[PDB]
Each structure stands twice: as structure tokens, then as C-alpha cells.
Amino acid sequence: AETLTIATVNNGDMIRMQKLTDDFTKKNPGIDVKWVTLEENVLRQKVTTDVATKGGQYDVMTIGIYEAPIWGKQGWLAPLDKLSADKDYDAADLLPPVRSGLTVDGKLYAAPFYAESSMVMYRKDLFEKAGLKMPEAPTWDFIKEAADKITDKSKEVYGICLRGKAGWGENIAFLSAMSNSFGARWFDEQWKPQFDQPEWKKTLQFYVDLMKKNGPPGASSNGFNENLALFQTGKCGMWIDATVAASFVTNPKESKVADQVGFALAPDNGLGKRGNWLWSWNLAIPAGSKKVEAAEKFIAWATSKDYLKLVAEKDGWANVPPGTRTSLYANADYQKAAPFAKMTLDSINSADPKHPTVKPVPYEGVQYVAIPEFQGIGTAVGQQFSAALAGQTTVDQALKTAQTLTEREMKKAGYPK
Numbered sequence: 184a185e186t187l188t189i190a191t192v193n194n195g196d197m198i199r200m201q202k203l204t205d206d207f208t209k210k211n212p213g214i215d216v217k218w219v220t221l222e223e224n225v226l227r228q229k230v231t232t233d234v235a236t237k238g239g240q241y242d243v244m245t246i247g248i249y250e251a252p253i254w255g256k257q258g259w260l261a262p263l264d265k266l267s268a269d270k271d272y273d274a275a276d277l278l279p280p281v282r283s284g285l286t287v288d289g290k291l292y293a294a295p296f297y298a299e300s301s302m303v304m305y306r307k308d309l310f311e312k313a314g315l316k317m318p319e320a321p322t323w324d325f326i327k328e329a330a331d332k333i334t335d336k337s338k339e340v341y342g343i344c345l346r347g348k349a350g351w352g353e354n355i356a357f358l359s360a361m362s363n364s365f366g367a368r369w370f371d372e373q374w375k376p377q378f379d380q381p382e383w384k385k386t387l388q389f390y391v392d393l394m395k396k397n398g399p400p401g402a403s404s405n406g407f408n409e410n411l412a413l414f415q416t417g418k419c420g421m422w423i424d425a426t427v428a429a430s431f432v433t434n435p436k437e438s439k440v441a442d443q444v445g446f447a448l449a450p451d452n453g454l455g456k457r458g459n460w461l462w463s464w465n466l467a468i469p470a471g472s473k474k475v476e477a478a479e480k481f482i483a484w485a486t487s488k489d490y491l492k493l494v495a496e497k498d499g500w501a502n503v504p505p506g507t508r509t510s511l512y513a514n515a516d517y518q519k520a521a522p523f524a525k526m527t528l529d530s531i532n533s534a535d536p537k538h539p540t541v542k543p544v545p546y547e548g549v550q551y552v553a554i555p556e557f558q559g560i561g562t563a564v565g566q567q568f569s570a571a572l573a574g575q576t577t578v579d580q581a582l583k584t585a586q587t588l589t590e591r592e593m594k595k596a597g598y599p600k
């Protein structure tokens with residue numbers, strides 16, 4: 184009777200959902216589902232276009248915690264009021280930092296499919312061999328020291344892998360969060376960019392030096408999913424990235440290293456911010472959809488306690504989508520299955536998008552800046568920083584250009600207001 188076209192990202196938990204929709208259609212027999220599966224940079228571009236232009240291409244959209252409140256405030260998204268009121272759905276069980284990030288003027292504009300922070304994943308075996316112990320709360324100087332000791336570029340072992348692929352939510356997510364730990368900020372309180380200041384220089388130079396010495400070849404091509412593969416296939420001593428990866432790297436069905444993974448907090452520099460981030464991937468409906476009832480039903484199915492149970496039954500408790508529900512972290516079976524759960528939740532809770540930086544800022548967001556202009560600005564700055572990583576431009580030149588383009592775009596948009 185109704186068919187939903189759903190735009191989503193090519194991440195593992197979504198690929199897994201695509202295999203489980205018979206459960207949805209069995210429970211909702213008039214409703215079928217088809218997919219448009221895209222890399223995250225491209226998803227963002229296509230969904231933004233669709234939603235802004237009322238393109239009608241996607242009935243359900245996979246969107247981030249960045250987009251949800253912006254688009255929600257603008258009137259571009261249908262409110263998920265039926266979900267918010269539904270007893271079995273139990274929206275109160277959604278983690279508060281996550282639910283609150285998706286809510287505007289008392290209405291929920293997207294439902295979280297999974298959420299995450301960031302942390303260090305490392306190879307226990309390679310640490311033991313190098314004579315190293317990972318502190319629970321490492322510094323960046325320790326990470327640098329460790330990476331230098333583990334690299335064995337002859338045996339295709341890189342001491343560290345980090346995001347290098349250009350994109351507002353790819354390399355820029357990682358670098359922005361890392362910069363906070365170095366005492367940087369994107370903007371001062373007058374919305375002047377800060378790429379010409381010492382803390383961004385320190386961050387970017389630290390990153391480029393680290394990656395040139397100890398990272399994989401062509402890292403400027405590696406996003407989240409390429410790094411996940413490098414880590415899983417045993418090529419990476421340490422990877423500092425999304426907590427969602429923890430289940431994937433410890434699944435022996437897809438990870439050679441599954442029994443050798445350790446976890447520690449995002450690294451810092453003793454400045455008072457660690458820079459662990461807060462992200463969620465969410466499902467949303469365009470305002471003015473003529474398929475709201477069916478779309479609501481799908482979103483409720485995918486983001487319910489029952490969906491977690493469905494995945495647990497099929498693939499094991501460790502492999503459910505993380506970070507969305509108090510009841511998941513309270514579940515003894517999940518805790519037994521997922522040794523990374525406590526640190527994941529602790530990190531989701533400690534992430535501080537309200538106060539991301541050492542110096543006060545006019546924006547919110549750890550790894551992004553919560554303004555509508557960020558997609559375009561972050562994309563352009565991501566291209567500069569990827570070029571610096573690749574040795575195509577100097578670190579200093581990349582920062583000069585980032586400063587100039589950001590000034591240009593912000594003045595064009597009218598800041599400060």
C-alpha cells in the first residue's frame with residue numbers, strides 16, 4: 184500500500200538495519216521500504232538539497248544532531264509528536280543529552296538511531312610488545328610517543344590512524360574536537376575566526392607531523408569507514424574515533440583483532456577540555472510529507488527498545504545500536520556483552536557541546552559549529568586541511584586560507600549580528 188524511500192549512510196549499523204526490515208513489514212503489512220545508501224559527505228549534500236528545495240526524493244531522512252534542531256526550528260521537519268506521546272516507545276528512556284539535542288520548543292524533530300562520543304581504541308598486543316601501558320586518560324604527548332614506538336611501516340603496521348578525508352563531518356569533526364583539547368576555538372565572541380591563532384597551529388601541525396611519521400599512506404582519502412577497515416584488518420596500533428566503532432572492532436566475524444582491542448578516553452593536554460564529541464544519527468520526516476503516518480511507524484520501529492532486542496537476538500547484545508537509551512545501559516545482558524558500554528555512556532555524558540572550549544565561544548558543538556553556514560564552511564576548511572595532510576600545501580598556508588575563506592563566508596552571512 185505505501186512504500187517509503189529512505190536516505191541513509193553506509194555505516195555498519197544501517198547496513199544491519201537493512202537486513203532486518205522484514206520485522207517492520209511483518210508488523211506493518213501495508214508498508215514497504217526501499218533505500219538510498221550514501222557515503223556521509225554525499226548523504227549530507229543530497230538530503231540538504233532535498234529538504235531545502237522540497238524535492239520529494241526521500242520520505243525518511245537520516246540526519247545528524249547538527250541538522251535536527253536547525254531544520255526543526257526552520258519548520259523543515261515534521262514533529263514526531265506521536266512518538267513522543269507513545270507509551271511503548273517510551274521517549275523518556277532516550278538519553279537526555281541526545282533527546283535534548285533533537286528537541287526544539289518542546290517538540291522532537293528527529294529520533295536517534297544511534298549515538299556516540301569519541302575515544303581511543305588500541306591494540307593491546309602491540310602495546311604489550313612495545314612495552315607500553317595505555318593510561319585510562321591519556322595525553323596527546325603520550326599518544327605521539329606510543330605511535331612512534333608501534334609503527335613498523337615494513338610490516339604494514341601504522342602506529343596511528345586518524346580521519347584525513349575532507350568533509351565538514353569527516354576530517355573537520357575529528358580536527359575540531361582535537362583542537363578543543365589544544366585550547367583552540369573556531370570563533371571568538373565577535374565571530375572572528377581563529378585559524379591564525381597559536382592553538383589551531385599547534386593542533387594542525389601536531390596532527391600532520393603525527394600522521395606523516397606514523398600514519399597510513401594516502402590518509403587524506405581515509406574517512407571513518409576506511410579507518411575502521413584499517414583497524415579491523417590489523418594495520419593500526421591506535422585509532423581515535425567514534426565510540427560506535429567499539430562493537431565493530433570487537434566482532435570476531437568482521438575483525439581480525441577483535442580479542443586484542445583496548446579502550447581509553449579521548450586524549451587531552453591538561454588544559455581542561457578532552458574534546459570527546461557528541462554525535463547522533465537520527466531519522467526524520469520532511470514537513471509536508473504526505474506519508475507521515477507510515478514514516479512515523481518506521482522511525483518508531485527503528486528507534487525502539489524492541490529494535491535493540493531484535494538485533495540482540497540475531498547478532499548478539501554487543502552489536503545493538505548504541506548510545507540512545509538509558510534502558511540499554513541499565514541492561515545486565517548488554518553490560519556483560521559490551522565491555523565498552525560504561526566508557527561509551529560516560530563519554531556521551533561528559534561531552535560538552537554547551538561549553539566545548541577553554542575560552543568562551545558564541546556557538547555550541549564540540550566537533551561542529553552549530554550554525555547553518557557550517558556545512559559549506561567546514562567543507563571548504565576540510566579541503567584545506569586534507570591538502571596539508573597530503574603535503575600539497577603547508578600547515579601555515581592551510582590555516583591562512585581557512586582564515587580568509589571563513590572570514591569571507593561569515594561576513595557574507597552577516598556575522599556578528
Ligand SMILES: OC[C@@H](O)[C@@H](O)[C@H](O)[C@H](O)CO
Pocket residue numbers: 194223299351352353356407425427460461462550
Ligand atoms: O557514526 C560514525 C560517523 O558517521 C560519525 O562519527 C560522523 O563522522 C560524524 O560527522 C561525527 O561528528
